[PDB]
Amino acid sequence: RPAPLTLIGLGPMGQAMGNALLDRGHGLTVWNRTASRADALVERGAVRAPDVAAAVAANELVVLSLTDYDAMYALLGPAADALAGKVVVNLSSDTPEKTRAGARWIAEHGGTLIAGGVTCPPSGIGSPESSAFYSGPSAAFERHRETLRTLTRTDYRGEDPGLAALWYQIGMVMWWNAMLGYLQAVALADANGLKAADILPHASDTVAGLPFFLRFYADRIDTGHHGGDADRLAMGTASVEHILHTMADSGVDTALPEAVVAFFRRGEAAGYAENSFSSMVELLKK
Template sequence: MSDNTDTPVTVIGLGLMGQALAGAFLKAGHPTTVWNRTASKADRLVAGGARLAPTIGDALAAGPLAIICITDYHAVRELLDADGAELGGVTLINLTSGTSAQARAAAEWAEQRGARYLDGAIMALPAAIGTVEAVILHSGSRSDFDAHAPTLGALGTVTYLGPDHGLASLYDVAGLAMMWSVLNAWLLGTALVRTAGVDAATFAPFARQIAAGVAEWLPGHAEQIDAGAFPAEASALETDARAMAHLVEESEAVGVNAELPRLIKAMADRSIAAGHGKEQYPVLIEEFSRQRGD
């Protein structure tokens, strides 16, 4: 966390996350200016020492660093264009969720208006902001990131990904893919054991142990993917596919939705048909890397 509390900060957008961001800057001692279309959302922050700007232009003029966190990239451009706000000399950090293409377009748009621009993604719930558990990803100019990293440290654990403005958004959706996949796998497993009277709380510790064990495989699997070679060090894909068939059969037999295991088995079957049955599971990266129909 940062001990540098001299830099003024502006926060535009005071939803739950925006309020948490502004609150963290205030707690760290930064002079904090806020703006929101509904001004009453700033009441608690103003009571805590924030300054409510009457316009976005006034908010941006309050200091060199502006954080914006609203609904989407279109709303960012619409909001700043409509107000005719002067962006010259401001480092704009956009923590709005969207796609990597939108992030790159937003960077070009902001830079054409004289702003320095960093794109970002918040990998945390509002309650975690201001703690080390809050991971904030940034992409864009390294020098711009370095200039403001001490201030941004008030929000949590800040991470620089690289000069491509789209990287933060890509990491964000990749993280969501991981999160939902783990949760969906746990829900499927829970649905299966419930058919035998086992409740979710009883199954959860076992499921957590499995998830942690699988996580340990990732560095080795990553080496195989990056090398483009998939020797079957633990098991071959054709062996895994037989286990997938058992999962599908069991799900159907006990009346549990089998769409998810059928989908993964179909991908494995395509990979085996392409000659990869003797290779290890990470060879499926080739299936995940192509669009359906390719």
């Protein structure tokens, strides 16, 4: 049942990915720019391909966990011709356009690229609650969907490889902003005698109440309802200025809070003070 596969890219994610596959009983062949990284997996039952050309040729499925799509060209460029009949599932982050450019390159060499965006940390590889967006030619994705179901759940977003990257970037823009806000909160807390452990209960309660506002503002934004019934930008403009000045009074970097105040200053200049802060989506759109 568990089909063989080549995994190139053995960082935090691909290492855990190879673990989850060998665990299920898959035929793992691992290659990496840093060949030292392919050693614990190789000791657990994986074959070190001596070259990327041999890696690409060992199996039909080539899974990629690299920092970006440029890393793919740099690793598979030496073996470009060996990509014929091969299916490259790139679980690497990049722009939809750069994701499609990768697909085109694999396509010039007789292979098909399936894009992928894992929405889980390395600890989540092998966990059923973990999911990944996938996009690109259906047949190639479908004939490997079950080996990919070993890593995460499969959410097909379309035939355009760019869609999986677009959906990953949609969730990551919220993830990174919230996590930079955590780092900002931890820094304000350290400047005030507190630890991340002291502010963790509140932080978690704060981010878990977020889905309410996500729903509250979804339909309202999709209809142009930016009424000040639950909030006025003017009140929130004061709120973000309070974060900036509280941070400044406590000696904490003000670059990120000053950039947030600037966005609210643009909303005030657009006449949105009596409207919901949601109105500022019209400054981000188009």
